[PDB]
Each structure stands twice: as structure tokens, then as C-alpha cells.
Amino acid sequence: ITGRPEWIWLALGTALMGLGTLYFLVKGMGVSDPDAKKFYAITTLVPAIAFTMYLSMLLGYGLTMVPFGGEQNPIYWARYADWLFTTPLLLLDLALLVDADQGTILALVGADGIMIGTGLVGALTKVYSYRFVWWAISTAAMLYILYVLFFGFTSKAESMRPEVASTFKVLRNVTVVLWSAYPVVWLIGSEGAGIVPLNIETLLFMVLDVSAKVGFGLILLRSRAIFGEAE
Amino acid sequence: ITGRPEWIWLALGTALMGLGTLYFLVKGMGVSDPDAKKFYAITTLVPAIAFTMYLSMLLGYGLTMVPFGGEQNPIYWARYADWLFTTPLLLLDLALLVDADQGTILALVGADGIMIGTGLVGALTKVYSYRFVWWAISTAAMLYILYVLFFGFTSKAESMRPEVASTFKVLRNVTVVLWSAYPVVWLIGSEGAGIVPLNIETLLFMVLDVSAKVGFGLILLRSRAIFGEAE
Amino acid sequence: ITGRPEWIWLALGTALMGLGTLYFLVKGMGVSDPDAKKFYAITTLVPAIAFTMYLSMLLGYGLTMVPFGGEQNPIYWARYADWLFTTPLLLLDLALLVDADQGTILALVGADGIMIGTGLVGALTKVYSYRFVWWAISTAAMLYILYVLFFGFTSKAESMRPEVASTFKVLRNVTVVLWSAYPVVWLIGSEGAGIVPLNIETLLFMVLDVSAKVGFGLILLRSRAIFGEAE
Numbered sequence: 001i002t003g004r005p006e007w008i009w010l011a012l013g014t015a016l017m018g019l020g021t022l023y024f025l026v027k028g029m030g031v032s033d034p035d036a037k038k039f040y041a042i043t044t045l046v047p048a049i050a051f052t053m054y055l056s057m058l059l060g061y062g063l064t065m066v067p068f069g070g071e072q073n074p075i076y077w078a079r080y081a082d083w084l085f086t087t088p089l090l091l092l093d094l095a096l097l098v099d100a101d102q103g104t105i106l107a108l109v110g111a112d113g114i115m116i117g118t119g120l121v122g123a124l125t126k127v128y129s130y131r132f133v134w135w136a137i138s139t140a141a142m143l144y145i146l147y148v149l150f151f152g153f154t155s156k157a158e159s160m161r162p163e164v165a166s167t168f169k170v171l172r173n174v175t176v177v178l179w180s181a182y183p184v185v186w187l188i189g190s191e192g193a194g195i196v197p198l199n200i201e202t203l204l205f206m207v208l209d210v211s212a213k214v215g216f217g218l219i220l221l222r223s224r225a226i227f228g229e230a231e
Numbered sequence: 232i233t234g235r236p237e238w239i240w241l242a243l244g245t246a247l248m249g250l251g252t253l254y255f256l257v258k259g260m261g262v263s264d265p266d267a268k269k270f271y272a273i274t275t276l277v278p279a280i281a282f283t284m285y286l287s288m289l290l291g292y293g294l295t296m297v298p299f300g301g302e303q304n305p306i307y308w309a310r311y312a313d314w315l316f317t318t319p320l321l322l323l324d325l326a327l328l329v330d331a332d333q334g335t336i337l338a339l340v341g342a343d344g345i346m347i348g349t350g351l352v353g354a355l356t357k358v359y360s361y362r363f364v365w366w367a368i369s370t371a372a373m374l375y376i377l378y379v380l381f382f383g384f385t386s387k388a389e390s391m392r393p394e395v396a397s398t399f400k401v402l403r404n405v406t407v408v409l410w411s412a413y414p415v416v417w418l419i420g421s422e423g424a425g426i427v428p429l430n431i432e433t434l435l436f437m438v439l440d441v442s443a444k445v446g447f448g449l450i451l452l453r454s455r456a457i458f459g460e461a462e
Numbered sequence: 463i464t465g466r467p468e469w470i471w472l473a474l475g476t477a478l479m480g481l482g483t484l485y486f487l488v489k490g491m492g493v494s495d496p497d498a499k500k501f502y503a504i505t506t507l508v509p510a511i512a513f514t515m516y517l518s519m520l521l522g523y524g525l526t527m528v529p530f531g532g533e534q535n536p537i538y539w540a541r542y543a544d545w546l547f548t549t550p551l552l553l554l555d556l557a558l559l560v561d562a563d564q565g566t567i568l569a570l571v572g573a574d575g576i577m578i579g580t581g582l583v584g585a586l587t588k589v590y591s592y593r594f595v596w597w598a599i600s601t602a603a604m605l606y607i608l609y610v611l612f613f614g615f616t617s618k619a620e621s622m623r624p625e626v627a628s629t630f631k632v633l634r635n636v637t638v639v640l641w642s643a644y645p646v647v648w649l650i651g652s653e654g655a656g657i658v659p660l661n662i663e664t665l666l667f668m669v670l671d672v673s674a675k676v677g678f679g680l681i682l683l684r685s686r687a688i689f690g691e692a693e
């Protein structure tokens with residue numbers, strides 16, 4: 001395990017996701033409100049899935065070698081397995097907060113699936129120049145998602161409770177900033193142009209992942225917006 | 232890319248799915264009705280997914296070699312990845328049109344999953360005679376789906392709005408004819424008996440795919456059946 | 463096929479799932495009640511999926527070799543493909559019976575996904591001692607599911623119809639006993655410590671699978687709890 005310099009960040013990531021999972025699990029024990037239960041379920045599952053995939057990367061299972069540029073390049077494929085399930089759960093948290101219509105939710109989840117799926121294909125593609133074609137398609141799917149979060153959701157939040165409108169606005173802003181960093185790190189890291197070494201890349205993704213999951217969850221689950229308006 | 236004679240049909244397929252995706256995306260921009268949004272979301276996602284998988288076939292990612300009959304046989308596995316997601320979306324379009332009950336929808340999607348999954352296993356099976364066992368099981372799942380579309384849905388459409396009944400009937404008929412061709416092409420093509428060469432097989436699937444997705448979508452999204460009855 | 467001593471149990475399993483599938487399919491033909499249709503759909507799909515995966519194991523497709531302990535160890539990976547889809551369907555049968563809230567259903571299905579997914583990783587892991595780390599995480603996800611079935615569902619059933627409360631209690635008890643045997647068989651069988659040989663392991667899983675699917679389904683589909691209260 002320690003044979004890879006990036007192991008320290010995989011281990012820290014595993015620990016922080018594990019701790020985040022346990023914290024949300026305990027916190028949600030005292031919850032009976034049916035609406036709050038939905039948000040706790042979604043939000044606890046996110047770091048639990050990430051915990052398993054960080055562990056698989058730490059132990060070496062979630063790593064494969066991909067030939068491109070005349071080299072055997074270490075590619076952590078387990079990231080995409082994580083993201084396939086956790087990024088639509090994160091979007092679902094946002095969509096339920098603002099009572100999004102079903103068509104909009106399906107558009108978001110579908111675009112998200114395309115985003116992660118094409119990122120996976122790009123990560124595993126052996127023809128170097130083609131990796132960036134997949135990156136571009138994935139990034140276009142991301143831009144669609146960000147567009148919807150701003151010009152379909154923000155003006156939906158404003159007709160809702162003030163506490164859900166303010167909580168949505170904060171989580172929207174956190175999401176757009178954090179999620180936009182992922183394609184940049186991929187592009188300059190070992191999957192793309194290879195300018196930033198894998199150990200630093202792994203650190204960067206770990207900070208983004210913990211912030212986008214445990215950070216996000218801490219903000220959401222401390223808000224009164226997750227509860228039905230009750231006396 | 233041009234090293235494979237079937238590349239021209241993969242390229243045309245990619246282009247037509249891409250163009251179809253953009254057309255539906257633009258067309259649905261001016262839509263606020265919650266019901267119509269569902270149909271636009273579902274129907275736009277279908278060629279978008281197909282676009283990505285056609286591209287993966289064009290670039291060579293979605294192709295593998297399978298030993299059977301003492302030969303290395305080129306198998307485009309990306310078709311099944313496409314179909315796994317797009318065929319239940321197509322069925323969902325039909326089921327929502329007639330306000331199908333939840334049990335019926337689950338039966339359809341489940342049978343569809345079995346249909347595509349067993350087709351994939353058959354496509355990748357190395358014992359030649361066993362490929363046709365999987366083809367038979369998949370075809371039985373197809374026949375179940377077609378049965379339900381006729382003797383569970385058609386008489387559901389007739390108690391609904393005339394515009395939804397007439398639109399459903401047309402899309403049902405398009406679906407049954409087009410979908411029934413797929414097992415025949417598989418059986419006589421490079422996956423099955425090998426009587427029709429891969430380049431012609433690829434052409435045939437491209438015509439079926441564009442018709443079943445973009446053709447289907449053009450009929451559906453031009454109907455007033457996708458809108459709630461409103462003043 | 464007969465080259466593997468466990469083939470007889472794979473063949474019997476295939477037959478019993480096939481027969482169970484046909485029986486439930488015929489039985490549900492005379493059903494119009496929308497609630498009952500849901501239970502028939504879910505419950506018929508379960509042995510149908512299991513039939514396909516038992517067949518893939520019989521024909522040899524669903525088997526791979528995994529190096530650990532200095533040996534090539536036969537691992538039937540198709541079990542996890544089965545279980546990935548059938549165990550959440552089984553939980554859905556239980557959850558719908560007691561009209562579980564959406565948050566609880568998502569927690570169950572999510573924990574179940576983690577349970578099966580980590581079992582799959584453990585089954586395919588090449589470092590022997592690490593296989594048991596994945597077994598432990600999977601078992602913890604199982605224990606969560608069993609906890610919810612007892613201390614979240616049982617007291618939900620009691621405020622419902624007596625026929626649904628009594629049917630739920632029986633199916634809950636069947637589920638907890640049968641499902642708890644699976645991690646034990648894995649641990650002592652060819653995936654784990656290797657004390658029980660593969661042919662006996664295969665027998666054990668076949669008895670558990672038929673009981674947990676066809677047995678379970680026979681109890682559920684003969685109950686009046688699956689019908690809406692109607693005059």
C-alpha cells in the first residue's frame with residue numbers, strides 16, 4: 001500500500017468519509033419527520049459509497065494501468081464508480097429541496113450519467129488525442145447541469161419557503177464552484193496532459209470530494225429546510 | 232478509423248443522433264408544462280445516449296474481439312450499453328402516454344432489462360451453439376413486452392384522451408415493427424449465423440436505431456398528447 | 463458442463479427458478495387490482511433474473527478464476543449480478559407491504575447495494591487477508607438492513623391491516639433467517655476460508671436462493687395482503 005506516494009491522501013480520504021458517514025448516521029437517529037428522513041438517507045449514503053471506493057483505491061483494487069503516450073499510466077477507475085452513484089444523489093438533494101418537477105430531475109440525472117460515463121470512457125481510452133474528445137463531451141454535460149441549477153432551480157427556490165431558498169442558494173453556490181474544479185484537475189492531471197503529478201492530483205480530488213460530500217452534507221443537515229413546516 | 236468498412240455507417244449514425252439530440256434540446260426550450268417536460272426529458276436523453284455510444288464505436292472503444300467458430304469475431308458491445316438505457320426510456324415514453332400503473336411499468340422495464348442483458352451475454356458467449364440459447368431467452372422477453380404493449384396498453388389508451396389514444400397507437404405500431412427487426416438482424420448477422428456481413432449489419436442497425444429513436448421522437452414531440460389538457 | 467461436480471446443483475437451481483417464474487407468471491394473469499399487480503411484477507421478476515444467472519453459471523459464462531492463496535480459485539461472479547437486482551426487489555416487496563416512507567426505502571436499497579457491491583469486490587480481491595475486510599463491511603451493511611426490518615418496519619406493520627401485519631411478520635422472519643446464512647456460507651466456502659468445498663457450497667446457496675425467492679414468493683402471493691381493501 002505504502003509503495004504508492006499518493007497512499008497518504010487515499011488513507012486520509014477513507015478516514016474522513018468513514019467519519020462523515022458515522023456522524024450523519026448518528027445524527028439522523030433522532031429523526032421521524034418523513035421529509036427529513038429523505039434528506040438524511042440521501043446524504044448519509046453519499047459518503048458511505050465514497051468510503052468504500054476510497055478504500056478500494058487504498059488497497060489497490062480500484063486502480064488499473066492504461067497504455068497511452070507510450071507509457072503504462074496508473075488510472076484510478078474507482079472514482080467513476082463512486083461518482084456514478086454519488087453525483088446523482090447530490091443532485092437529488094438539491095432537486096428535492098426546491099420540489100423540482102419530475103422531468104427536470106430526469107434531465108439532471110441523465111445528463112449527470114452522461115457526464116460520468118463519458119469521463120470514464122475518456123479515462124480508459126488508449127488513443128491519447130481521443131481522451132480529450134470525451135473530456136469535452138463530459139464537460140458539455142456538466143455545463144448543462146450547471147445551467148439548470150441556475151436558470152431552472154434558483155427561480156424555483158424563490159417561490160418556496162425562505163429557509164429552503166436560502167439553504168438552496170448556499171448549496172447551489174458550493175456545488176457550482178466545487179464541481180467545476182473536477183474537469184480542470186482531470187485535464188492537467190495524470191488522466192489528461194500530465195502536468196500535475198498523480199500524488200498532487202490525488203490530494204486535490206480528496207479535498208474536493210470531502211468538501212463536496214461531507215462539507216455539503218454538514219450545511220444541508222443543519223438546516224431547518226429539510227423539515228416539513230410543522231407546528 | 233477508416234480501416235473498418237463499416238465506419239461510414241457508424242459516422243452517419245453518430246451525426247444523425249447528434250443532430251437529433253440538438254433538435255430536441257432546442258425544441259424543448261420553450262416548454263413550461265410539467266407533463267410535456269417529462270416527455271422532452273425522456274425523449275432528448277435517448278439520442279444523446281445513443282450519440283455517445285455510436286461515437287465510442289466509431290473511435291473503436293466500443294468494439295471487442297470474441298473467439299467463436301475458430302475465429303476472432305468483431306463484436307460491438309457498446310450497442311448493449313446504449314440499449315440498456317435507451318430501450319427502457321422508450322418504453323417509459325409509451326407507458327406515461329397511457330398513464331400505465333406502476334406494476335405494469337416495472338414489468339416492462341424488468342423484462343426489457345432481461346432482454347438486453349441476455350442479448351449481451353449471447354453476444355459475448357464463446358460456445359457457438361449457446362449463443363442461440365441466449366438469443367431465444369432474449370426473444371421471449373421481447374415477446375412479453377410486445378404482448379403487454381398490445382393487450383395491456385392499447386385498451387388502456389382507448390379510455391384516455393383521443394389525442395393520446397391516436398398518438399399511442401401510431402407509436403405502438405412503429406415500436407412493434409422496428410423492435411421486431413433487431414433479433415432478426417442479430418441472428419443473421421455477425422453475432423449469429425454470419426450470413427450478412429458486418430458492414431451491412433451495421434447499416435441495418437443504424438437505420439433501425441435512427442428510426443426507433445429520432446423517428447419515434449419526431450412523432451411524439453409534435454403531438455399535443457404530451458401536454459396536459461389546459462385552457 | 464458436467465466437468466464440474468457442482469453442475470448438478472446449478473442445473474437444479476436453474477430448473478426450480480424457471481418453474482417458479484412460470485408459476486408466478488401464470489398465477490398473475492388473472493389480476494387487475496393495481497396494488498396486487500405491483501407485488502406480482504416485483505415477485506415474478508426475482509426468479510426470472512435468478513433463472514438467467516443460474517443458467518449462465520451452468521453454461522460456464524458466469525465463472526471466473528481468481529488468484530489467491532497461490533491457487534486459481536473458481537469464483538462464480540454471476541451470483542452478485544443476480545443479487546444486485548433481486549435483493550433490492552425482495553426488500554421492495556417488504557417495504558411496499560408496510561407502506562414504508564421513501565427515505566426508508568432509499569436507505570434500504572442503498573445499504574443493500576453497498577452490501578452486494580462490497581461482497582463482489584471481496585470475491586474478486588487477490589490479496590487474501592483483504593477479502594475478509596470487504597466481507598466485514600458487507601456484513602455491517604447487512605446488519606443495518608436487518609435492524610431496519612425489525613426496528614423501523616415491524617412497528618409500522620402493526621398500525622396497518624391485520625392481514626398485512628401478519629404476512630409482513632412471517633416474511634420478515636423468513637428473510638432475516640435466510641439472509642443471515644449467506645455471509646456464513648461465503649466465509650467458510652471457496653470465497654473465504656475454503657473449509658467447505660465448492661460443490662457443497664453451491665448446494666447450500668441453491669437451497670437458500672430457492673427458499674428466499676420462490677419460497678418467499680409463494681407465501682406473499684397467496685396472501686390477501688397484496689390486494690387493496692375492496693368490497
Ligand SMILES: CC(C)CCC[C@@H](C)CCC[C@@H](C)CCC[C@@H](C)CCOC[C@@H](CO)OCC[C@H](C)CCC[C@H](C)CCC[C@H](C)CCCC(C)C
Pocket residue numbers: 084109110113114117118120121124280283294295308311312313315316351
Ligand atoms: C439514464 C442515465 C443512466 C444514462 C447513462 C449515460 C451513459 C449511457 C453514458 C455512457 C455509459 C457507458 C460509457 C458505460 C461504459 C462502461 C464501460 C466503460 C465498462 C468498462 O468496459 C470498457 C472496456 C474496457 O475499457 O471493456 C472491454 C470490453 C468488454 C467485453 C465490455 C463488455 C461489457 C460492457 C461494459 C457491458 C455494458 C454494460 C453497461 C455499460 C453498464 C453501465 C456501467 C456504468 C459505467 C454506466
Ligand SMILES: CC(C)CCC[C@@H](C)CCC[C@@H](C)CCC[C@@H](C)CCOC[C@@H](CO)OCC[C@H](C)CCC[C@H](C)CCC[C@H](C)CCCC(C)C
Pocket residue numbers: 315340341344345348349351352355511514525526539542543544546547582
Ligand atoms: C430490473 C432489471 C434491471 C433486471 C436486470 C436483468 C438482468 C439480470 C439480466 C442479466 C444482466 C447480466 C447478464 C449482466 C452481465 C454483465 C456482464 C456481461 C458484464 C461483462 O462481464 C462478462 C465477463 C466477460 O464476458 O466478465 C469477465 C468476468 C469478470 C470478472 C466479471 C465480474 C464483474 C461482473 C460483471 C459484475 C456484475 C455487475 C452487474 C452485472 C452489473 C449489470 C451490468 C448491466 C449489463 C446489467
Ligand SMILES: CC(C)CCC[C@@H](C)CCC[C@@H](C)CCC[C@@H](C)CCOC[C@@H](CO)OCC[C@H](C)CCC[C@H](C)CCC[C@H](C)CCCC(C)C
Pocket residue numbers: 049052063064077080081082084085120546571572575576579580582583586
Ligand atoms: C445506490 C446504490 C446503488 C449504491 C451502490 C453501492 C456501490 C457503490 C457499492 C460498490 C459498487 C462497486 C464496488 C462496483 C464495482 C464493480 C466492479 C467489481 C466491476 C468489475 O471490475 C473490477 C476489476 C476487476 O476485478 O475491473 C478491472 C478494471 C476495469 C478497467 C474496470 C473499469 C470499469 C469499471 C467497473 C466501471 C465502474 C462502473 C460501475 C462500478 C458500475 C456498477 C456495477 C455494479 C456492480 C454496482
Ligand SMILES: *C/C=C(C)/C=C/C=C(C)/C=C/C1=C(C)CCCC1(C)C
Pocket residue numbers: 083086087090115116119120135136138139142179180182183186209212213
Ligand atoms: C463527490 C464527487 C463529486 C461531486 C464529483 C464530481 C465530478 C465531476 C463534476 C466530474 C466532471 C468531469 C468532467 C466534467 C469532464 C472530465 C472528467 C470528469 C469526470 C472529471
Ligand SMILES: *C/C=C(C)/C=C/C=C(C)/C=C/C1=C(C)CCCC1(C)C
Pocket residue numbers: 314317318321346347350351366367369370373410411413414417440443444
Ligand atoms: C434504440 C435501440 C433500440 C430500440 C433497440 C432495440 C433492440 C432490441 C429490441 C433487441 C432485441 C434482441 C433480441 C430480442 C434477441 C437478440 C438480441 C437482441 C438484443 C438484438
Ligand SMILES: *C/C=C(C)/C=C/C=C(C)/C=C/C1=C(C)CCCC1(C)C
Pocket residue numbers: 545548549552577578581582597598600601604641642644645648671674675
Ligand atoms: C436471492 C438471493 C438472496 C436473497 C441473497 C442474499 C445475499 C446476501 C444477504 C449476501 C450477503 C453477503 C454478506 C453479508 C457478506 C459476504 C458476502 C455476501 C455478499 C454473501
Ligand SMILES: CCCCCCCCCCCCCCC
Pocket residue numbers: 181184185195196197200
Ligand atoms: C482548480 C485547481 C487546479 C490548480 C492546481 C494547482 C496545483 C499546484 C501544485 C503545483 C504543481 C506541481 C508541479 C510540480 C510537480
Ligand SMILES: CCCCCCCCCCCCCCC
Pocket residue numbers: 412415416426427428431
Ligand atoms: C429485417 C431485415 C433482415 C433482412 C436483411 C436483408 C439484407 C439483404 C442484403 C444482402 C445480403 C448480403 C449477402 C451478400 C454479402
Ligand SMILES: CCCCCCCCCCCCCCC
Pocket residue numbers: 643646647657658659662
Ligand atoms: C449456515 C450453514 C453453514 C453450515 C454448513 C454445514 C455444511 C456441512 C457439510 C459438511 C462439510 C464438508 C466438509 C468435508 C468435505
Ligand SMILES: CCCCCCCCCCCCCC
Pocket residue numbers: 084085088089092102105106109113
Ligand atoms: C447510472 C446510475 C443512475 C442511478 C443513480 C441513483 C440515483 C437515482 C436517483 C433517482 C432520482 C429519481 C428520478 C425520478
Ligand SMILES: CCCCCCCCCCCCCC
Pocket residue numbers: 315316319320323333336337340344
Ligand atoms: C438496468 C438499467 C435499468 C434502468 C434504466 C433507466 C430507466 C428506468 C425508468 C424507470 C421507470 C420508473 C419505474 C417506476
Ligand SMILES: CCCCCCCCCCCCCC
Pocket residue numbers: 546547550551554564567568571575
Ligand atoms: C444497483 C441497482 C439498484 C437498483 C435495483 C433495482 C431495484 C430498485 C427499486 C427502487 C425502489 C424505489 C425507490 C424509491
Ligand SMILES: CCCCCCCCCCCCC
Pocket residue numbers: 139143146147150180183184
Ligand atoms: C453556462 C451555465 C452558467 C453557469 C455555469 C458556469 C460555468 C463554469 C465553467 C466551469 C469550468 C469547466 C471547465
Ligand SMILES: CCCCCCCCCCCCC
Pocket residue numbers: 370374377378381411414415
Ligand atoms: C405475442 C404478442 C403479439 C404481438 C407481438 C408480435 C410478435 C412479432 C414477432 C417478432 C419476431 C421476432 C423474431
Ligand SMILES: CCCCCCCCCCCCC
Pocket residue numbers: 601605608609612642645646
Ligand atoms: C442487529 C439487528 C438485530 C437483528 C439482526 C440479527 C443479526 C443476525 C446476525 C446474522 C449473522 C451474520 C454473520
Ligand SMILES: CCCCCCCCCCC
Pocket residue numbers: 128129132133136
Ligand atoms: C493530443 C491533443 C490533441 C488535441 C485534442 C483536443 C480536442 C478537444 C476537443 C474540444 C472540442
